[PDB]
């Protein structure tokens, strides 16, 4: 199914991002980078196209792929307030380029969105156009993607993926549970950060990694009942997240979920607000997609065949907010620690994923190294 | 359907006592963890007391320890919450909660919640 192929490609890209940022917060969208690279597939030909299709494990034009992706997209948006999620996938191409006959309508038919034509030779004008598109399709939250001097007059093609997420848990953490608690960073140092607390019957599994280390894995359902956040931290303090990160897949997360049972626990979880901008060039080149970035090697002749053309920039920017209101009657019941004899404290670095549970689609994933 | 119903609420003056009761018509509570939580006007709900389904263990929130006693009447399929030395701050709607086979009360995520009964402590 496309959901697993799209997710696992995006997870392989995340692994490239994480290894370059091993001791810093990262939030990333596996689904997002797969969705926009699938769009780029339609613009490419020759070796450039083959490199993308190889890395992704499928071809957007093969029988059933594009509609399956439309259903996936139309499905991941549903169970949300307008204030809770917002995504955009966009290809921007120089406006005076003659495009291949029939490309624009075939693109629109496949993805139900349009390639955007912009005049990159008017650099500030073009930067404002891209920035406003991203702003108005991320609920205003990704409001300044490209800074002054980030667009070049010789730019001809830009890819952007931007996502904002602030979903509310099925049981929100109670506001009166807010407190400060020590968080132990990977380098051995500590920092006191705001945390919240909630007792619940949490879906939980203890997972043993191939290297023999125990992980606490916990599910936090979102109010729509279709998305959940999975939290995974080692039981032992000085176990790096990298080892588990480098075997992650949509099926492994489904394996965790299948082994979970609901257990009574007091969960203490930091508040966190993460913001990551990923220059996708190096991670994509590491996965074999080199030609698309090379001015004379790139083949974009399905989009335009009479002018040379390559990707000047490929960016993902993601903003996620966790534990930041609901009605007083709809937050959790506050339960003091005296009433809760079993607890899990997330006071050390952890992995998280936001998952579409009916499909297993990995919408977001990241590491919290310092809240 | 298991439907918890609370009774025994009322108005008392500071220092007095009430005995709340929780029952579900047609069902024995002896195999449920049974708890009480409360909600004062404008505030978030807070857990107050709990009795295990498995052992004798009981649990009490800090502000009621030594004043409240949760206990079972198995003949009546009932759980009582004895509230002594009531203070104005104990004014709230009090709710019963039940969770099959559990050793303590999470309140959130428990199988069943009652609809509440008013307790008012005032001169």
Residue numbers in the entry:
A (entry chain A): 7 to 330, 333 to 379
B (entry chain B): 1 to 123
Sentences from the paper on this structure:
In this study, we report and discuss the crystal structure of the stabilized active PAI-1-W175F variant in complex with Nb93. The asymmetric unit contains a single PAI-1/Nb93 complex. The structure reveals that Nb93 binds a large part of the surface-exposed RCL (residues 337 to 350), including the bait peptide bond P1-P1′. Nb93 has its CDR3 loop folded over the FR2 region and binds PAI-1 in a sideways orientation, thereby enfolding the RCL in the groove formed between CDR3 and FR2 and FR3. The parallel orientation of the RCL to the 5-stranded β-sheet of Nb93 results in an interface of 948 Å2. Indeed, Asp62 and Glu65 in FR3 of Nb93 interact with Arg346 (P1) through the formation of two salt bridges. Furthermore, P1′ residue Met347 fits into a small hydrophobic cavity formed between the side chains of Nb93 residues Tyr59, Trp104, Phe107, and the disulfide bond formed between Cys50–Cys105. As a result, Nb93 binds PAI-1 in a protease-like manner by directly interacting with the PAI-1 RCL and by combining the exosite binding mechanisms of both PAs, i.e., by interacting with residues that are normally engaged in exosite interactions with the 60- and 99-loop of tPA and the 147-loop of uPA. Therefore, our structure supports a directly competitive mechanism of action for Nb93, i.e., by directly blocking the binding sites for PAs. Similarly, binding of Nb93 disfavors RCL insertion, which is required for spontaneous latency transition and leads to a 10-fold increase in the functional half-life of active PAI-1.
Plasminogen activator inhibitor-1 (PAI-1), a 45-kDa glycoprotein, is the main physiological inhibitor of plasminogen activators (PAs) such as tissue-type PA (tPA) and urokinase-type PA (uPA). As a member of the serine protease inhibitor (serpin) superfamily, the PAI-1/PA reaction follows the basic mechanism applied to all serpin/serine proteinase reactions. To this end, PAI-1 carries a flexible surface-exposed reactive center loop (RCL) presenting a substrate-mimicking peptide sequence Arg346-Met347 (designated as P1-P1′). In contrast to other serpins, PAI-1 has the unique ability to spontaneously convert into a stable latent form by inserting the RCL segment N-terminal to the P1-P1′ cleavage site (residues 331 to 346, designated as P16-P1) into the core of the protein.
